[PDB]
Structures are given as structure tokens and as C-alpha cells.
């Protein structure tokens, strides 16, 4: 299995804390360099947490478990059409496979799969997710991926961890971004096998994850040459 | 694939209607005569609604899909032992098999099978299900199998269909009604195959609803050898 020793964070003067209806924490950064855009959450998830399944279409994304436990989905098909939906009304419901994550495994999610986590434990777990903005669709506002406007309307700003905020979109608010964001589980899924088709095991892009990391360095060294925010 | 042709509802005087946070409406009923004792929603249940992953220990349930559309879940695994649970930190999670019902499909589940279903439609659909109090535990307080008072706890009464009521429990109530509920989709579910075995598809008990039809329109026909409230 692939690992990845560490994803650090950037370190921000005023970190932007969501807090989910699913009493997730996303603790999230938005950087940017010459050559590169990208977003990252380092997130804690309870028991039950985590995104149901969705399909991005202007980030490629990577998964990364500081100490497994997290259980991930993914498709062998793609999905190239944002258009046409994996719906019993429309194009038809799609195959997942489970992850059974391992401490520090690294798992990499083009654009264009459906994909998804959730913590099947009884302990809250870490897990960090990253998104480097793609090639698609130059008109699209978010050179980050958008993962920051995405989230402030799926819940609260905490303003205090220590006392966090009473709970009222994470589905209906997703396409805006390029995402296709299913509200229940079974919305898009026909099956769920934990069979794991080679090809999804052996998706890998530690090339740009490395850069990202130098960005997130960078930053965190006082580098005026990038910008997290 | 087995039918059924009609499941009345006893018409109470004034009748327990249940919204859920899923949206869904439960109209329910508690009947018993002589020889037994049962319970009977009638429901609407929105895109994305029904009931997650579970297991009965004390009654047996049939569902009845008068439109089909309804997908129902359903293991080949029984789970006799309530102490059990099918999760990650103990038993371990199970397989399920999906079911694409047709209009009066009659699917019956005994106890200790894992079950549920979702609309993953986009039209709101009927579905009627059937509890059967079974021969388990004297000392359990429901003669019917506890519906009405389960169900009271996961949502508020409708006193106006025309203007539902606002929404503020279904997993953490469950196991005083010999009921094993997950919280979340995923939460028993190691996989699910759209590959039906023959065993679940055969699974029938028409002599017992047959009984409880028989008792339903009984009362509705004013007859006080039997009762339901
Ligand atoms: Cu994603
Ligand atoms: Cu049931
Ligand atoms: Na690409
Ligand atoms: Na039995």
C-alpha cells in the first residue's frame, strides 16, 4: 500500500474552523504559488462522519489517514459528463469499492471518480484531503478548487473549539464548485464491494502532492513567494 | 416475484401520524385479537427517506410497495444474538442484498435478518410495512412490538398535514424495542451486491398477514372481538 510520511498545515493568523451538521471539523487553508493552486482541510471526523459520495470535476483530489481506520469508497468507472447524473432517474447509479485505511496511506482521486469516507469506528479519527485545482473550465471563479467558499455553507464558523456552534446545503450548493454531491448514501450507489480493483489501488500523483508540501513549507518558513490564506 | 393484493389501514378515530426528520409520514396502527398481535404503518416516504440498516429480535415485518420504486436491503446472514452488533469494534459489519420493488411487491424479513430501504427515486412513494409481535421475550412490554411508542420518540405528532410541524433518537431508542438501528448507512454494512439469492427472494409467510388483513377489516367493519388504537 502507498504511504506519505507527512501533509503539513498552514499555519494561518486566523484559521478558518467549520464545523458540520455531522460534528466534522475542517481546519482549512487555501495557498497558491507561480505554477500551482490548491486547497487543504486537515480534519477531525467522528464516528459516522464523512462525505457521502461525489464526483469533482475541476480538482483532483488526494486522501491521506495519519492513522488509518477511515473507510474510503471509490469507483473504478469515470464520470467525464457533469451533466448526467449517477441517478436511477438519469445515467444510472454507479460501483464503489471500500478502502480499508492503514496509518499514513496515501489515497489519489482524479477528477471525474466517485469517491466518499466515512468513519466506521467508535473513536473520532484524522484525516487530511487535499485539492489541487485541474485544467477545466477557465471561467470558474476558485483557482483553489473553492473548497473554502464550499464549506462556510455547509456549516458554522468556530469561533471557539472549546465551545462550538449550534448546527443551522452540503449537497444542493455542491455543483457551483463542480461538484456533483449526493445527499444520502445510496443516492448514487447500486453496490458497495470490498473486492479492490488494481487500478484504483495503484492511482498515484505524489509529483504534485510534493509541490503542494513545498508551498505549504514555504508559507510556514515566511516565503513571500506563495500565499496561503 | 410474490404480490399481495390489498393491506387496509385501521381507521382510528383519531390516527397517529409521525414526520420524521427524513421528512417521512407514518400513519400507524396497533391491533390486537386473540391469537395476535401486530402493528401497521401506512408511510410516504420522500427521495432519499426510509430507514437505515437494522435488525428485530421481537417481531417479524413485512413490507408492501403498492408503486414499487422502493429499493429495500436484505442480508442472507441471520443475527440471533442481540448482543452482537454487526460493527467494525465487535461482530463485524455484514453483506446486504438490494431488492428493486414492483407495485405490491410483498417482501416479508423474518427476525434477526438485517434490513432497510431508501426512495432513491425522485417522486415521493408509498410503502406499508407490517410488524407481528413473535413468541421472544414474555417479559417485553408490547404486545404489538412497540411501533407506536418507538416511532413517537424519533419525531413530533402531525396535528396538521396541511402545515407539518418543525423537527426537533431512531438508532439510540431502538434496543428497548428489541430493535438493532444503525446511525448512519455504512454503519452494519461491509457490502451490498444487486445480485438477489434465491433463499431472501423466497422468504414468505401469507398465512400470517393474511390473519392480520383479516383483523384489520374486521375492526374497520365495527366488530369488537377485536381492537386497534
Ligand atoms: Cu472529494
Ligand atoms: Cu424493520
Ligand atoms: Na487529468
Ligand atoms: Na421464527
Given at each position: 500500500?502507498?504511504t506519505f510520511d507527512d501533509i503539513?498545515?498552514?499555519?494561518?493568523?486566523?484559521?478558518?474552523?467549520?464545523?458540520?451538521?455531522?460534528?466534522?471539523?475542517?481546519?482549512?487553508?487555501?495557498?497558491?504559488?507561480?505554477?500551482?493552486?490548491?486547497?487543504?482541510?486537515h480534519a477531525?471526523?467522528?464516528?459516522?462522519?464523512?462525505?457521502?459520495?461525489?464526483?469533482?470535476?475541476?480538482?483532483?483530489?488526494?486522501?491521506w489517514t495519519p492513522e488509518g481506520g477511515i473507510?474510503?469508497?471509490?469507483?473504478?468507472?469515470?464520470?467525464?459528463?457533469?451533466?448526467?447524473?449517477?441517478?436511477?432517474?438519469?445515467?444510472?447509479?454507479?460501483?464503489?469499492?471500500?478502502?480499508?485505511s492503514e496509518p499514513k496511506q496515501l489515497?489519489?482521486?482524479?477528477?471525474?471518480?466517485?469517491?466518499?469516507?466515512?468513519?466506521?469506528?467508535?473513536?473520532?479519527l484524522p484525516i487530511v484531503?487535499?485539492?489541487?485545482?485541474?485544467?477545466?473550465?477557465?471561467?470558474?471563479?476558485?483557482?483553489?478548487?473553492?473548497?473554502?467558499?464550499?464549506?462556510?455553507?455547509?456549516?458554522?464558523?468556530?469561533?471557539?473549539?472549546?465551545?462550538?456552534?449550534?448546527?443551522?446545503?452540503?449537497?444542493?450548493?455542491?455543483?457551483?464548485?463542480?461538484?456533483?454531491?449526493?445527499?444520502?448514501?445510496?443516492?448514487?450507489?447500486?453496490?458497495?464491494?470490498?473486492?479492490?480493483?488494481?487500478?484504483?489501488?495503484?492511482?498515484?500523483?505524489?509529483?504534485?502532492?510534493?509541490?503542494?508540501?513545498?508551498?505549504?513549507?514555504?508559507?510556514?518558513?515566511?516565503?513571500?513567494?506563495?500565499?496561503?490564506?
Amino acid at each position: 500500500i502507498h504511504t506519505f510520511d507527512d501533509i503539513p498545515m498552514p499555519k494561518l493568523a486566523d484559521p478558518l474552523l467549520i464545523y458540520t451538521p455531522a460534528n466534522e471539523i475542517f481546519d482549512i487553508a487555501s495557498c497558491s504559488a507561480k505554477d500551482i493552486g490548491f486547497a487543504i482541510a486537515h480534519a477531525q471526523i467522528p464516528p459516522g462522519g464523512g462525505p457521502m459520495p461525489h464526483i469533482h470535476y475541476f480538482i483532483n483530489e488526494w486522501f491521506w489517514t495519519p492513522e488509518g481506520g477511515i473507510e474510503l469508497f471509490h469507483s473504478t468507472k469515470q464520470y467525464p459528463n457533469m451533466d448526467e447524473l449517477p441517478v436511477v432517474g438519469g445515467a444510472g447509479r454507479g460501483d464503489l469499492y471500500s478502502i480499508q485505511s492503514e496509518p499514513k496511506q496515501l489515497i489519489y482521486s482524479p477528477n471525474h471518480y466517485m469517491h466518499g469516507f466515512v468513519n466506521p469506528t467508535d473513536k473520532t479519527l484524522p484525516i487530511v484531503f487535499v485539492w489541487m485545482r485541474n485544467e477545466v473550465a477557465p471561467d470558474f471563479p476558485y483557482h483553489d478548487g473553492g473548497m473554502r467558499e464550499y464549506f462556510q455553507a455547509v456549516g458554522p464558523r468556530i469561533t471557539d473549539l472549546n465551545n462550538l456552534p449550534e448546527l443551522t446545503a452540503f449537497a444542493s450548493e455542491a455543483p457551483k464548485y463542480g461538484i456533483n454531491q449526493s445527499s444520502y448514501f445510496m443516492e448514487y450507489v447500486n453496490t458497495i464491494s470490498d473486492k479492490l480493483p488494481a487500478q484504483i489501488a495503484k492511482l498515484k500523483n505524489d509529483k504534485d502532492l510534493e509541490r503542494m508540501v513545498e508551498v505549504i513549507e514555504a508559507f510556514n518558513r515566511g516565503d513571500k513567494s506563495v500565499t496561503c490564506s
